[PDB]
């Protein structure tokens, strides 16, 4: 047992409290870098010229933010898609003014989270599991790529990447609605069906399994003690849950098969969020939501407003006010 | 054409309204398109000098075909709705346009994504099948049961 | 993978009931507040600072500018009974747009 | 920043009263045989 072999055995060991693995070898340092930089920046980073117009936006707690308003601010529009590591700056002060921490954090994070997905596959293989939990995780991951990387690529600037902050997130959403009418995009709508539906099926499944817990406890104790970790027998009666739910709707709308049920529970929100991610990723290339502005016209040619037109008025408000000092020419083409 | 000295016109932010410097000094177009200064195109390069956009060439050498081409491209920006209403999301119906570039990029991003998913799916499965547990854990031989507890 | 895991199935499924149910109930409470315009609209400290200090800018103040746009541009068509006539000159707009 | 100063105590108690509740319940659970 030579040193490389020993090291490989430790890395791929299923006895480590937290699995490391080869993906973990990339994951750990990148996630640590992203995390440390993120914490330090969130607390103490000076204001950042996000839109490249020498108008620094304050993101950190020390510079007048609370938890809700605070953010790590996207790198400067003057940088665009240029790579801006620390060593490309003349000084740390420059790097901070121009929003370098954002780039460091999102590149390390995206790498890290990709490796996190890989690591899910990897441990599944070491444990003799089926491999596809990582495929479920690809949906939130693809989403993160969409808002941190793909959308900047399409719009030509990380300054349009989602900010790392709560209110920054809201800003990104509102401007996105102004520029792409995402609400009217069927992929976002499928996203909403994905997460609404996923929440629904979450409560549904939870409530049905809970409703059919086999009596193993007295009323003074938690029903949870009626299940013991590793017990071979199922802890609820799926036949009773099926009888109930089948009668709630009709028999053929209910799952009698736990495998196909749990597959459905996996598939619905994962597919939905895949579409959400694809929405952001394709609106990144300005294929935007449905436009029915002035679609309804009367016999004379008068515009008859619909709700789409009201939506358009709101969108116009967002468009004309956003980045109020950044545009010199009449069309906002990116 | 209206008589503005575009080289010296200071915009509201203090950056040049028309012309500014890139982070490495090159003279570039101002406004938001500051992000796009890496752009190179046959209609633009004649205005380019060693330091970027050349103010003398701008003042003296802009040809009508360049004005035409810029107007055309500006009015055919790859922005449009899913039902092919050209323009920004707030534009009214009139112009039936979505750029071929948007169609091609979006289509192939979607396809590429799902093919990455298919890669995860089939690679994970191929691993599992080769090792012999793609149909599930053998009850009589569950690996985790042969493993020391984590704590 | 993640450090912690469920070990109890009953608790797992109860938790699956609890999370979205509780979330929806919380959102409901918030909307009951909005019935009275009892909003979470502002952070007063932010507004005091920003009112006094024109170089102070956060994503919170940015978003308020967006809201102001939404209100002015959508109110006349969205609330026709109010008969809002907002001349072009009073409409809030940034540069160029 | 002109925050509301009561915020501090409001937050402190918000954290401390229920946390302490839990801690009491937990410790006397551990001390039961």
């Amino acid at each position: 047992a030579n040193l490389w072999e020993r090291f490989c055995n430790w890395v791929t060991s299923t006895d480590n409290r937290l699995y490391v693995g080869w993906f973990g070898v990339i994951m750990i340092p990148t996630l640590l870098a992203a995390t440390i930089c993120f914490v330090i920046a969130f607390i103490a980073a000076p204001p950042v010229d996000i839109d490249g117009i020498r108008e620094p936006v304050s993101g950190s707690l020390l510079y007048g933010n609370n938890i809700i308003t605070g953010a790590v601010v996207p790198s400067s529009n003057a940088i665009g898609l240029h790579f801006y590591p620390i060593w490309e700056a003349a000084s740390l002060d420059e790097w901070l003014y121009n929003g370098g921490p954002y780039q460091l954090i999102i590149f390390h994070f995206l790498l890290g989270a990709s490796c996190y997905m890989g690591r899910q596959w990897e441990l599944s293989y070491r444990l003799g599991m089926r491999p596809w939990i990582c495929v479920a995780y690809s949906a939130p991951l693809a989403s993160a790529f969409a808002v941190f990387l793909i959308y900047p690529i399409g719009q030509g600037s990380f300054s349009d990447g989602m900010p790392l902050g709560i209110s920054g997130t809201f800003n990104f959403m509102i401007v996105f609605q102004a520029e792409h009418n995402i609400l009217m995009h069927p992929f976002h709508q499928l996203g909403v069906a994905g997460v609404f539906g996923g929440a629904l099926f979450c409560a549904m499944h939870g409530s049905l399994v809970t409703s059919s817990l086999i009596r193993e406890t007295t009323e003074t104790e938690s029903a949870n003690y009626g299940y013991k970790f590793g017990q071979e027998e199922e802890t609820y009666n799926i036949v009773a849950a099926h009888g109930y739910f089948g009668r709630l709707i009709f028999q053929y709308a209910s799952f009698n098969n736990s495998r196909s049920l749990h597959f459905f529970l996996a598939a619905w929100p994962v597919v939905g969020v895949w579409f959400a991610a694809l929405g952001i990723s394709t609106m990144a290339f300005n294929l935007n939501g449905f436009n029915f502005n002035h679609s309804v016209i009367d016999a004379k040619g008068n515009v008859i407003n619909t709700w789409a037109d009201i939506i358009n008025r709101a969108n116009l408000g967002m468009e004309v006010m956003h980045e109020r000092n950044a545009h010199n020419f009449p069309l906002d083409l990116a | 054409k209206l008589g503005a000295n575009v080289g010296s016109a200071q915009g509201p932010t203090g950056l040049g309204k028309y012309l500014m410097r890139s982070p490495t000094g090159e003279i570039i177009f101002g406004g938001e398109t500051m992000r796009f200064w890496d752009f190179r195109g046959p209609w633009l390069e004649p205005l380019r000098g060693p330091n970027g956009l050349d103010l003398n060439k701008i003042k003296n050498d802009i040809q009508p075909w360049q004005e035409r081409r810029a107007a055309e491209y500006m009015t055919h920006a790859p922005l449009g709705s899913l039902n092919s209403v050209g323009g920004v999301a707030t534009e009214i119906n009139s112009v039936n346009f979505v750029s071929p570039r948007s169609w091609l990029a979006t289509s192939h991003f979607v396809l590429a994504f799902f093919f990455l998913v298919g890669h995860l799916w089939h690679a994970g499965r191929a691993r599992a099948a080769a090792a012999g547990f793609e149909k599930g854990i053998d009850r009589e031989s569950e690996p985790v049961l042969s493993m020391p507890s984590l704590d | 993978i993640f450090g912690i895991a469920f070990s109890n199935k009953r608790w797992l499924h109860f938790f699956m009931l609890f999370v979205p149910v509780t979330g929806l109930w919380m959102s409901a409470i918030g909307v009951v507040g909005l019935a009275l315009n009892l909003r979470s609209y502002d952070f007063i400290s932010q507004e005091i600072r920003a009112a006094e200090d024109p170089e102070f800018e956060t994503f919170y103040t940015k978003n308020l500018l967006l809201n102001e746009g939404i209100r002015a541009w959508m109110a006349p068509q969205d609330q026709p009974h109010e008969n809002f006539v907002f001349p072009e000159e009073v409409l809030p707009r940034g540069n160029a747009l | 920043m002109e925050v509301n100063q009561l915020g501090l105590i409001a937050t402190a108690l918000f954290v401390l009263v229920p946390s302490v509740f839990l801690i009491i319940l937990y410790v006397q659970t551990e001390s039961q045989q």
Partner: peptide
């Protein structure tokens, strides 16, 4: 003061992560 508060609460959460992971109730098979 607010900053101290925010960061403190945050720090407590990270500490809690530590204990919840490494000083958890061991799951015991029965």
């Amino acid at each position: 003061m607010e900053t101290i508060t925010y960061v403190f609460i945050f720090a407590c959460i990270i500490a809690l992560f530590f204990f919840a992971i490494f000083f958890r109730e061991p799951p015991r098979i029965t």
